[PDB]
Amino acid sequence: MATLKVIGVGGGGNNAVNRMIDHGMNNVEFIAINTDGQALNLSKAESKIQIGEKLTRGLGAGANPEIGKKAAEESREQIEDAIQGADMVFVTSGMGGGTGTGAAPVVAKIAKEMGALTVGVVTRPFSFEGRKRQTQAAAGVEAMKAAVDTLIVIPNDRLLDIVDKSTPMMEAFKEADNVLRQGVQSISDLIAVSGEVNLDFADVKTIMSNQGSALMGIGVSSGENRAVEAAKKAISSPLLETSIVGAQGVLMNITGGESLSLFEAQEAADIVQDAADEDVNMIFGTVINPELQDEIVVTVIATGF
Numbered sequence: 317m318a319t320l321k322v323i324g325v326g327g328g329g330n331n332a333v334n335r336m337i338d339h340g341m342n343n344v345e346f347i348a349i350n351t352d353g354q355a356l357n358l359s360k361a362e363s364k365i366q367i368g369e370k371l372t373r374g375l376g377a378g379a380n381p382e383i384g385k386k387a388a389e390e391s392r393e394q395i396e397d398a399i400q401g402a403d404m405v406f407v408t409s410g411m412g413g414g415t416g417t418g419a420a421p422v423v424a425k426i427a428k429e430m431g432a433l434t435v436g437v438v439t440r441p442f443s444f445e446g447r448k449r450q451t452q453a454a455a456g457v458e459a460m461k462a463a464v465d466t467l468i469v470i471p472n473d474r475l476l477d478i479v480d481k482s483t484p485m486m487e488a489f490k491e492a493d494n495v496l497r498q499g500v501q502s503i504s505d506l507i508a509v510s511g512e513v514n515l516d517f518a519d520v521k522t523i524m525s526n527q528g529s530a531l532m533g534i535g536v537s538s539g540e541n542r543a544v545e546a547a548k549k550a551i552s553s554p555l556l557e558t559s560i561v562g563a564q565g566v567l568m569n570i571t572g573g574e575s576l577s578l579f580e581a582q583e584a585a586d587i588v589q590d591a592a593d594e595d596v597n598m599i600f601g602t603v604i605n606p607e608l609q610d611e612i613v614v615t616v617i618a619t620g621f
């Protein structure tokens with residue numbers, strides 16, 4: 317049974333983790349990593365690592381990614397110890413600050429050294445934060461890409477595409493944080509449940525090990541044309557930087573009730589295939605959940621660009 321850990325690094329990453337702790341994911345271990353002792357003290361994470369006590373005296377890294385990097389390197393043994401035994405690690409962080417930008421790639425590097433399939437989920441700053449913030453964040457993203465197995469990048473500007481003029485900022489932030497939450501829940505489902513056409517953690521590693529940026533999504537529909545609608549929703553991910561176009565690897569699962577038809581499954585798979593590379597390494601799964609009535613749920617991860 318694969319062990320999952322979710323690690324928040326710096327403010328934005330810990331914000332994401334705090335929402336997940338609030339909802340509950342009993343089988344998943346949450347780890348909070350920060351330079352900022354005040355923020356870390358308020359976290360309800362079961363496992364906390366204050367990095368850079370010597371460097372920052374319990375303050376943040378003040379927008380200097382070199383300080384975040386050095387803080388993580390200084391606490392390497394603590395980070396190793398907290399990760400040890402994980403089969404899969406998610407590292408969540410907002411790029412552009414001091415702590416996440418610098419520390420998150422070190423954490424991801426350690427995770428992979430400890431043997432974990434390592435997935436980064438990171439944001440790029442809003443354009444309103446300025447070119448400097450954006451340039452620091454880009455360096456972070458590239459460092460993350462080099463350290464992880466697979467990277468999911470959410471430009472914060474994409475949040476401006478999903479709000480109306482009154483949508484509360486915290487509600488917009490919840491939508492961005494749901495990318496991580498739904499990714500973790502979906503992998504938990506994959507590991508826990510034996511499928512009629514079973515996918516397991518070795519299939520996840522095949523598609524996700526030593527890749528780069530990825531598209532992930534989930535689509536739910538019912539009624540007429542449900543399979544096509546669910547597939548299209550799964551592959552259209554308005555918050556992610558990466559599109560499915562040209563994908564060389566896909567992991568795809570369809571979950572339906574007892575009415576799930578072979579014809580529908582083909583329709584959904586063809587939607588996903590059509591979008592990917594013609595030599596796509598596609599691994600397809602199915603689970604029948606008799607508790608469902610007319611809903612279909614299509615889950616996709618696409619890698620290799």
Ligand SMILES: NC(=O)c1c(F)ccc(OCc2nc(-c3ccc(C(F)(F)F)cc3)c(Br)o2)c1F
Binds near residue numbers: 435516
């Ligand atoms: N067919 C199965 O054995 C199966 C099951 F029984 C339940 C769920 C399930 O798939 C859920 C699923 N989860 C993923 C997935 C893929 C990637 C990630 C990521 F990127 F790590 F976030 C998270 C989740 C995918 Br593609 O599909 C199955 F494949």
Ligand SMILES: Nc1nc2c(ncn2[C@@H]2O[C@H](COP(=O)(O)OP(=O)(O)O)[C@@H](O)[C@H]2O)c(=O)[nH]1
Binds near residue numbers: 328332378411
């Ligand atoms: N979407 C989202 N972005 C955030 C959040 N908090 C911070 N950010 C973004 O993450 C960047 C770095 O902030 P933060 O993680 O607090 O800095 P650090 O603690 O110094 O790593 C900011 O420049 C924002 O673009 C959040 O809760 N949600």
Ligand SMILES: [Ca+2]
Binds near residue numbers: 509510515516
């Ligand atoms: Ca399974």
